[PDB]
Every structure is written in structure tokens, then in C-alpha cells.
Design a binder for this molecule. Structure first.
Ligand SMILES: [Zn+2]
Ligand SMILES: [Zn+2]
Ligand SMILES: [Zn+2]
Lengths: 97, 49, 50, 65, 49, 55, 46
């Protein structure tokens, strides 16, 4: 429901104000989906990229903060939240090949 | 004007990008041409001998 | 299939019959909550074939 | 996807009235008289009920199950 | 329509034009376009951002 | 290691797009800034292999 | 430790060890997702 009028002078050039209640009630709510993909190869040498499990901290017997979201297999589990710089796949490459 | 010596410039101008994803280093064409020049001088010496 | 954020928002929009005069504002922090400042609703639904 | 719980402008509870609305359209009832029966005086609630698309069932048809 | 101002509580002199219109949100959002740059990294060849 | 306190607890942490080494004990930085190849340059430069290099 | 997964379309509860070829028991599918986490997650109504 748009109202054609001027209001508060915050709509000078093509600007337009919204209703805080409407935004609270889900109007215009949007979702952004991004993919993150990695590959685990086997090289010409009979060696492969492998993923270690979470780095359990010795002091706390728990995964470190940078590794908190990783599951036991070393891959982040769906449903958990992710912050910046946190690891999603604990991928490790063979240095030889 | 006649050039009989070559000033090779410092490593600041010629990068050596060790590509950690592979077992190699990206190198400037200038360094390759310097290597070829040294090889040419040495092989000229060899052929003269 | 409903995303968790959308589900939480829809749950927030749902009104409650609780009388607000009988409670007090939850202080900053104290996310656990006490008897006075909060109520709890536990929702568990499992969908199975007939 | 799913019917919103509240009207965007006014905020009246509209989520519950959706299902019975389909029942009204299930019978002979038209749109306007069905909305009158549900009790939507202002036109924002009528807009929200009318303009909604029930994509949730189509997506559930693709759900793992 | 005859419209009363929310702030003052007094009716507006001019009639206002209410109506439902189709708004489509766009991909361009400020959350992705905002960018700030500290010292940060530099390039090997020319020491610039 | 820490030059003053001698603490070897140097940790790598990501700042606002800046790579640097800082000691957790005295918060003193030991090495900051990093040099990486840009795509515009990586696309032009050519990779070399050990075999062709050695002949 | 049983590391368990879910298959593509019959949603069979497939615990597989590492290095195993991706197969669906009672099927032959080769696309496969991970189950949901068990850890509690807090969401905000905002
Ligand atoms: Zn409405
Ligand atoms: Zn120190
Ligand atoms: Zn299956």
C-alpha cells in the first residue's frame, strides 16, 4: 500500500520511505543463497587431498573457535551459523604432488 | 651506443612467484631471456674453443 | 523445508494470550531468563504417513 | 511461499483465515463474498489474502520425504 | 482520500493518493556494495592496493 | 617469537583484510603486510616446470 | 564412531566409512547429503 505524497523531506530524489512495522511484519524480507564448493583430488602420485577432523583444543577438550562449526568428519554441518574467517572444510593437500 | 655489456636489473623488477598450488615458480620472461643470453655466451665460448 | 529464520520470524509474529501486567522486562543479558521475565513454549511436531 | 501471519499495513491476524478461505473457494463462493464472509473490511487484508500464492505445496512436492 | 497526519494528529489540507502497487526488490543491496579499505595488501610489482 | 618478552606464542589472525603476526601476550606485532600475485598479472605470467627448466 | 549421511531420493540412513564409493542401500544412487547437526542453535525473531 503506497501513498503518493511528500514526507519528512527524506524522499528528495527518487528516495522513498518504508514503514518500520511493515518491515517488521516480513514485507520485503529476502534470502540470499551462496554456494561454497571444494574439490579433493587424487594426484598422479597415489596420494590424495584429505580432510582432518576438528582441531580439538587440549586445554578444553573441545574444538577451537576457528574450528567450532566443523563436524567430526571435518566438514561443516548444516544448520549451524558461520562467522567470518571460520573454516568450512579442513582440507589438507599433500606437499609432494 | 654499441652495447657489449648488459645490466641485469634487481630482483625488485623481476618477480619470482612460487605457485604454492603446484611445484613451480612463475617467472618473468626477462629472467628467461637473461638465462638464454648467458647460455648463448657460454655456447659461443664453447664453439670458439 | 521452511528456513529457520522464516520459521522464527513467523513464530515471533504469533500473538500470545498472556497478560502483560503480570511480568517484567527482561534485563540486558540474562538470556536464560527467570520466572518473572519470560515464558516458554515447546513445539514438537513430526510428520508421518497414515 | 507460505501465507504471512500478519497484514503488512494494518497487522490483523490473516494467517489463520487463509485455510478456511480456500474452503470458501472450494464451494461456489466467489472471491469478494468469501472475503466479506471472512470479515476483511479494509482492503489491505483482502489484498494479502487475494494476492498470495501457495508455493509451499509445490515446494513440498519436491521435498525429500 | 482524506488523511490525518500521524505526527500532528491534524487532517491534511490536500487529499492523499492511497493504493496497492507492485514493488519488486532488486538484487543491488547496500550490504554487498559497502566497502572500506585500510592499509591492506599490496601488489608485488607495483606496491599499490 | 616476541623480541622483548621472548614469548613464542605468535598467532596469525585476520584483520580488516590485512595479514599480520601479533603476539598474544604483549599484543606487539612482529610482522605485518603480505605480497601476493594479482589475477591481472597471474594471467600474463607463464608457469615453469622443473623438467623444462633443468633441460 | 558412526559417521552417518542421507542419500539423494529414498532418504536412507546411510552410515558409510571414509573412502567408500557413494552408494544408496536399497538403491544405486550416487548423490548424497549430510544430516542436520545435533547441536542447539539460537535464532532471533527479528
Ligand atoms: Zn490486511
Ligand atoms: Zn610482548
Ligand atoms: Zn536412496
Amino acid at each position: 500500500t503506497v501513498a503518493v505524497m511528500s514526507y519528512s523531506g527524506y524522499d528528495i530524489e527518487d528516495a522513498l520511505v518504508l514503514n518500520k512495522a511493515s518491515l517488521d511484519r516480513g514485507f520485503g524480507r529476502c534470502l540470499v543463497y551462496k554456494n561454497a564448493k571444494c574439490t579433493l583430488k587424487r594426484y598422479t602420485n597415489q596420494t590424495f587431498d584429505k580432510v582432518m577432523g576438528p582441531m580439538l583444543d587440549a586445554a578444553t577438550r573441545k574444538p577451537i573457535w576457528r574450528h567450532e562449526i566443523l563436524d567430526a568428519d571435518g566438514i561443516c554441518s548444516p544448520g549451524e551459523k558461520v562467522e567470518n574467517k571460520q573454516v568450512l572444510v579442513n582440507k589438507s593437500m599433500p606437499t609432494v604432488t | 651506443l654499441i652495447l657489449t655489456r648488459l645490466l641485469v636489473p634487481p630482483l625488485c623488477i623481476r618477480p619470482s612467484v612460487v605457485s604454492d598450488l603446484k611445484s613451480g615458480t612463475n617467472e618473468d620472461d626477462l629472467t628467461m631471456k637473461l638465462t638464454e643470453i648467458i647460455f648463448l655466451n657460454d655456447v659461443i665460448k664453447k664453439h670458439r674453443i | 523445508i521452511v528456513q529457520d529464520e522464516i520459521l522464527a520470524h513467523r513464530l515471533g509474529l504469533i500473538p500470545i494470550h498472556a497478560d502483560p501486567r503480570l511480568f517484567e522486562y527482561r534485563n540486558q543479558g540474562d538470556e536464560e531468563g527467570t520466572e518473572i521475565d519470560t515464558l516458554q513454549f515447546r513445539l514438537q511436531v513430526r510428520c508421518t504417513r497414515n | 511461499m507460505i501465507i504471512p501471519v500478519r497484514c503488512f499495513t494494518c497487522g490483523k491476524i490473516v494467517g489463520n483465515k487463509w485455510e478456511a478461505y480456500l474452503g470458501l473457494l472450494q464451494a461456489e463462493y466467489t472471491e469478494g463474498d468469501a472475503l466479506d464472509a471472512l470479515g476483511l473490511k479494509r482492503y489491505c487484508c483482502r489484498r494479502m489474502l487475494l494476492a498470495h500464492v501457495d508455493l509451499i505445496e509445490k515446494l513440498l512436492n519436491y521435498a525429500p520425504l | 482520500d482524506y488523511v490525518t497526519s500521524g505526527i500532528t494528529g491534524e487532517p491534511l489540507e490536500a487529499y492523499i493518493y492511497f493504493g496497492p502497487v507492485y514493488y519488486q526488490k532488486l538484487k543491488h543491496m547496500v550490504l554487498d556494495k559497502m566497502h572500506a579499505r585500510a592499509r591492506g595488501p599490496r601488489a608485488v610489482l607495483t606496491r599499490q592496493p | 617469537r616476541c623480541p622483548d618478552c621472548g614469548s613464542t606464542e605468535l598467532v596469525e589472525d585476520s584483520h580488516y583484510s590485512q595479514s599480520q603476526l601479533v603476539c598474544s601476550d604483549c599484543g606487539c606485532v612482529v610482522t605485518e603486510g603480505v605480497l601476493t600475485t594479482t589475477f591481472s598479472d597471474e594471467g600474463n605470467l607463464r608457469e615453469v616446470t622443473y623438467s623444462r627448466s633443468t633441460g | 564412531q558412526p559417521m552417518i549421511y542421507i542419500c539423494g531420493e529414498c532418504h536412507t540412513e546411510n552410515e558409510i566409512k571414509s573412502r567408500d564409493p557413494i552408494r544408496c542401500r536399497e538403491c544405486g544412487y550416487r548423490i548424497m547429503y549430510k544430516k542436520r547437526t545435533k547441536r542447539l542453535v539460537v535464532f532471533d525473531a527479528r
